[PDB]
Design an enzyme around this catalytic site. Sequence first.
Site, PDB file in Angstrom:
ATOM      1  N   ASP A  44       1.037  -1.282   0.035  1.00 36.40           N
ATOM      2  CA  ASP A  44       0.158   0.077  -0.021  1.00 36.40           C
ATOM      3  C   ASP A  44       0.917   1.120   0.059  1.00 36.40           C
ATOM      4  O   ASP A  44       2.124   1.277   0.435  1.00 36.40           O
ATOM      5  CB  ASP A  44      -1.063  -0.115   1.236  1.00 36.40           C
ATOM      6  CG  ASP A  44      -1.974   1.243   1.382  1.00 36.40           C
ATOM      7  OD1 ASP A  44      -1.877   1.869   2.276  1.00 36.40           O
ATOM      8  OD2 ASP A  44      -3.194   0.952   0.650  1.00 36.40           O
ATOM      9  N   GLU A  90       1.472  -0.112  -4.723  1.00 37.84           N
ATOM     10  CA  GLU A  90       0.449   1.101  -5.093  1.00 37.84           C
ATOM     11  C   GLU A  90       1.132   2.194  -5.022  1.00 37.84           C
ATOM     12  O   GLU A  90       1.267   3.044  -3.830  1.00 37.84           O
ATOM     13  CB  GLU A  90      -0.585   1.017  -4.049  1.00 37.84           C
ATOM     14  CG  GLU A  90      -1.880   1.871  -4.506  1.00 37.84           C
ATOM     15  CD  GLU A  90      -2.363   2.857  -3.399  1.00 37.84           C
ATOM     16  OE1 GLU A  90      -1.626   3.331  -2.667  1.00 37.84           O
ATOM     17  OE2 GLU A  90      -3.589   3.377  -3.652  1.00 37.84           O
TER      18      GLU A  90
HETATM   19  C1  LIG Z   1      -4.304   2.087   0.600  1.00 37.19           C
HETATM   20  C2  LIG Z   1      -3.908   2.923   1.621  1.00 37.19           C
HETATM   21  O1  LIG Z   1      -3.117   3.780   1.697  1.00 37.19           O
HETATM   22  C3  LIG Z   1      -5.426   3.807   1.961  1.00 37.19           C
HETATM   23  C4  LIG Z   1      -5.435   4.684   3.204  1.00 37.19           C
HETATM   24  O2  LIG Z   1      -5.347   4.045   4.292  1.00 37.19           O
HETATM   25  C5  LIG Z   1      -6.342   3.142   2.124  1.00 37.19           C
HETATM   26  O3  LIG Z   1      -7.719   3.518   2.347  1.00 37.19           O
HETATM   27  C6  LIG Z   1      -8.310   3.103   3.621  1.00 37.19           C
HETATM   28  O4  LIG Z   1      -8.217   4.361   4.472  1.00 37.19           O
HETATM   29  C7  LIG Z   1      -8.982   5.508   4.058  1.00 37.19           C
HETATM   30  C8  LIG Z   1      -8.730   6.686   4.923  1.00 37.19           C
HETATM   31  O5  LIG Z   1      -8.825   6.400   6.253  1.00 37.19           O
HETATM   32  C9  LIG Z   1     -10.382   5.208   4.075  1.00 37.19           C
HETATM   33  O6  LIG Z   1     -11.234   6.264   3.615  1.00 37.19           O
HETATM   34  C10 LIG Z   1     -10.792   3.861   3.293  1.00 37.19           C
HETATM   35  O7  LIG Z   1     -11.898   3.332   3.066  1.00 37.19           O
HETATM   36  C11 LIG Z   1      -9.782   2.611   3.260  1.00 37.19           C
HETATM   37  O8  LIG Z   1      -9.880   1.782   2.594  1.00 37.19           O
HETATM   38  C12 LIG Z   1      -6.761   2.141   0.364  1.00 37.19           C
HETATM   39  O9  LIG Z   1      -7.800   1.726   0.251  1.00 37.19           O
HETATM   40  C13 LIG Z   1      -5.565   1.217   0.262  1.00 37.19           C
HETATM   41  O10 LIG Z   1      -5.702   0.853  -1.054  1.00 37.19           O
END
Ligand SMILES: *[C@@H]1[C@@H](O)[C@H](CO)[C@@H](O[C@H]2O[C@H](CO)[C@@H](O)[C@H](O)[C@H]2O)[C@H](O)[C@H]1O
Length: 476
Positions: A206, A230
């Site tokens: 991530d 990512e």
């Molecule tokens: C990668 C990751 O970096 C993202 C950030 O944590 C992630 O999103 C998650 O956190 C956000 C922020 O709190 C939420 O709004 C999302 O629902 C949650 O999935 C990405 O999904 C991940 O791919």
Amino acid sequence: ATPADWRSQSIYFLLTDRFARTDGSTTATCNTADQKYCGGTWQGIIDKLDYIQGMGFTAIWITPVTAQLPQTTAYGDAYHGYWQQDIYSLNENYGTADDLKALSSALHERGMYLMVDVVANHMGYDGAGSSVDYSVFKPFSSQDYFHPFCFIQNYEDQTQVEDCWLGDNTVSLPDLDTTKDVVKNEWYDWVGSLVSNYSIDGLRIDTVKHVQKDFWPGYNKAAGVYCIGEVLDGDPAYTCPYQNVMDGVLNYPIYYPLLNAFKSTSGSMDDLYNMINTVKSDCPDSTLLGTFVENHDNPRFASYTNDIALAKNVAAFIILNDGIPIIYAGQEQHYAGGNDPANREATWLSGYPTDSELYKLIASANAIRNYAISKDTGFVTYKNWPIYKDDTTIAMRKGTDGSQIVTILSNKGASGDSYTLSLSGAGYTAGQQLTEVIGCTTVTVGSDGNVPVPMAGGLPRVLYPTEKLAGSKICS
Ligand SMILES: *[C@@H]1[C@@H](O)[C@H](CO)[C@@H](O[C@H]2O[C@H](CO)[C@@H](O)[C@H](O)[C@H]2O)[C@H](O)[C@H]1O
Ligand SMILES: *[C@@H]1O[C@H](CO)[C@@H](O)[C@H](O)[C@H]1NC(C)=O
Ligand SMILES: [Ca+2]
């Protein structure tokens, strides 16, 4: 498993909370707007591996496994796994360490790979930056391990993108100071021990653009497996240089023009053609990128169009492009949720039908890719070659001469007219019989070397020599 091992794989990406419950229910409520745990588990996944493998996937990517913040925040639960607090404990919602080991083992017994999603950039915390009790983070139980509190506002300032926090004042994502040797060493020890304990074959990392590049080589080496990053940016000049510090990246450069080309009967085949050639030429290795059109961070394909022909074409592209295909759980059931949380639909509410149009399409496309790879060790390193485009069509060729797959895709959609496309540049010899392996019809290469491709119904066409299908289960 190595980057070379991963080139031949095809990934089904799932949210552990949303794919399969232990009880196997296909009716258990999962309101995406509630943003709560719906009860998917590692054991649930094991029980549905026939469903996944039936589409011809060789690997799964599951969301992160670490223990999370406990709260139901104003934005719901940590059901997604991206709000970690204790990296040496598992998220008990999904099961036990034995259940995660049993999922790895179940995949290996079927000759499949486990890929696990990991975050190095941040923890999660319910509440504003100034309210953070750093003592809840294990092992990073001190403010001294974190960057000072600030939000990313200037996305053109790469230093701010790396050093400031994601999230907001409601749910904060405390940003680890990944320039500190103690943080590098802890993460490197952790990732190697995670991979070892759970027999993990590969990682999806991530949040890569939010950590400075010098962190990543040591992390990829400590993991001891293929890592795909990512890097959430559509500019290949920004995203592809990350492949200098990590084995692969998700193909966000291809994502935007791939979505645009197929989401509408007016989409640009030129932009897709051009981006395939830009990535081919300017990314360190297009064959180690991950191709996708759907994930949990963007609206689903069918949220833009419910046209099933369009959905079949984009799925065929994902399978047949350079690199590792990645299909997001629900795509095969034509799920149409929009942005988060609407795109985190439970897969079980479909009833997991193996006779849906896109289950069948994906199974056909994976079948010919898996078959071609089994016969052609050069398929995965032959760089996909776009050979034709027009306003409604793109054709591409991949594989060793004599064994190449030639794919003709269309954005005409389901009310497309019937016509013959005379295709030059496919590289097959005159009189050669080809099987169109999606619909199982045959086409013969003309005296001039052109392929008379029957077009109808906006359907994708995937050509492979009939003589090379001897002994395969394809099209009988
Ligand atoms: C990668 C990751 O970096 C993202 C950030 O944590 C992630 O999103 C998650 O956190 C956000 C922020 O709190 C939420 O709004 C999302 O629902 C949650 O999935 C990405 O999904 C991940 O791919
Ligand atoms: C893996 O197990 C070892 C040995 O018990 C332990 O030292 C280590 O912390 C575990 N790693 C993870 C990430 O759970
Ligand atoms: Ca950071």
